[PDB]
Write a protein that binds this ligand. Structure first.
Ligand SMILES: O=c1[nH]c(=O)n([C@H]2C[C@H](O)[C@@H](CO)O2)cc1I
Ligand SMILES: O=c1[nH]c(=O)n([C@H]2C[C@H](O)[C@@H](CO)O2)cc1I
Lengths: 302, 309
């Protein structure tokens, strides 16, 4: 059966991901901007940044910001969620990780962006409950074989300069969200290594590979998740087992962004060499995926 | 290898599902209750009270539509988490179908399936104007893959009788909304139809233009009929592909479910035995490890101990 290579370009916003991956047998599943702005709701991006502003300015409550914020995170990852679901059937097993794949699918972000990272970063900003965050983790789709996630690398001061340009419609420069999101993505990369090096959160919770204190597990030592004796409630501990399961099988690659669009584009091409591809499940899988990838781009990509 | 029998008793509230599920277990078998404690303390505060009050404010014209959807969506997310984590934690243990075939080593009886929190209630609330169709479709797209041996028992009770029942059985925060009762009832009716329409070979894409245990129902008698919303329609007249792809997920999730109907218009003991009768002809599954049994047993017993009642 033909082989496919899936590549999910992810990381904090304002790094140059999209603006260097478009540059990059090869299909590009762009950002669902039309779905965020119109199809699922109107100006979701604007709504997100405005609520954090009213929150920050004391015009609304933590609880107000939280319901508005949770609701919107559902809108943000909808296209990512259906795409996975419709795609999942065609993904076969690892391809003796071989000749060039029949198709390379470049995604502008992975389902965990809206299901884990942004929700985690907003909890870190005081606008989302760790319980809501864990609800989204619990809803992360199973990790199919060949899930290659490229995360971005760029110094802060430089990310601020880019961010100053990658201003989405409705977006407001919030260096705190920029720091909350950078940290979240940082912990994300540490979590994968932790899990892949054989770390057990249950065994390390009472506080070579990263320290549990440097993985995403640190965020869930939140007072809301703990019983009167400091015990993590089981529902939550089960949501953490699922986070461990989902993340350990992912393949993570770092693309340094502190270089030229060419260089970034050039680097992404090199990383390609160690990504895990897979076989499709049917003869028509490739053609169907392509049309899927083109139909998504036309409709929701702006 | 040891087999397992999972049964989710679902359907509208105010019918007697929880009582009979209990009874059934009072006759091994383990009970996975409604995460009441999660809905009112662990996940958030008084979520059921929050749900019924928001619709109310909506109805009173005190809150706008958008205000309510924002609250409903969030509330519905809290309502389903225990169901969703339990399902994701169970999954690695579920093996292939066995059948019924002799008695199972373990029988799990669930109070509602994940699709209640991720589909039925949201669809009923959309229908009540308290949530958006895109949001419902967003939940649908997130319904977990249907494990084999998914036996769903949906309840039936005459409308008048259901109404009088509701007029008693007090849930904290729940305020008697009969419009919501009918909505939830119709949603569950469409659900049953949908599973079947799907099993009789129905194709929503082939039948879109038209908008066993019985003949194939009409697409307009299935859940697909709710998604004929102008919000989800492209200027050309058809659904945008995002929503169309979500409906493909719905058909895929409900196609492998084994739905059964239980009559609630009888005594609690009757419902128990009527249910204990449906059970026999229900699909079983092996577990993936022998120790899946003890594992599964404790998860259920732990869930109940921490979230039930
Ligand atoms: O789940 C998400 N939540 C969120 O708030 N965003 C913001 C980041 C950026 O400003 C713009 C483009 O990424 O959208 C993105 C995602 I995916
Ligand atoms: O997703 C859900 N949404 C909802 O509104 N409910 C209501 C029904 C009943 O009032 C009470 C107990 O079931 O909670 C239940 C679920 I599961």
């Amino acid at each position: 059966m033909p082989t496919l290579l899936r590549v999910y370009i992810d990381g904090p916003h304002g790094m140059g991901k999209t603006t260097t991956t478009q540059l990059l047998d090869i299909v590009y599943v762009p950002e669902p901007m039309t779905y965020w702005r119109v199809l699922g709701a109107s100006e979701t991006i604007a709504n997100i940044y405005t609520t954090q502003h009213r929150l920050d300015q004391g015009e609304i409550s933590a609880g107000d910001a939280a319901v508005v914020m949770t609701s919107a995170q559902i809108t943000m990852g909808m296209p990512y969620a259906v795409t996975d679901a419709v795609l999942a059937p065609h993904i076969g097993g690892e391809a003796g990780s071989a000749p060039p794949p029949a198709l390379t699918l470049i995604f502008d972000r992975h389902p965990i962006a809206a299901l884990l990272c942004y929700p985690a970063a907003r909890y870190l900003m005081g606008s989302m409950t760790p319980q809501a965050v864990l609800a989204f983790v619990a809803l992360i789709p199973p990790t199919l074989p060949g899930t290659n996630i490229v995360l971005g690398a760029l110094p802060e001061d430089r990310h601020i300069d880019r961010l100053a340009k990658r201003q989405r419609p409705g977006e407001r420069l919030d260096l705190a969200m920029l720091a909350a999101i950078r940290r979240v993505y940082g912990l994300l990369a540490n979590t994968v290594r932790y899990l892949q090096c054989g770390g057990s959160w249950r065994e390390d919770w009472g506080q070579p590979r990263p320290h549990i204190g440097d993985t995403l597990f640190t965020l869930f030592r939140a007072p809301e998740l703990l019983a009167p004796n400091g015990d993590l409630y089981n529902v939550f501990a089960w949501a953490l087992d699922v986070l461990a399961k989902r993340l350990r099988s992912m393949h993570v690659f770092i693309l340094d962004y502190d270089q030229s669009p060419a260089g970034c584009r050039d680097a992404l091409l090199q990383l390609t060499s160690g990504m895990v591809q897979t076989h499709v499940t049917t003869p028509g899988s490739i053609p169907t995926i392509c049309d899927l990838a083109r139909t998504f781009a036309r409709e929701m990509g702006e």
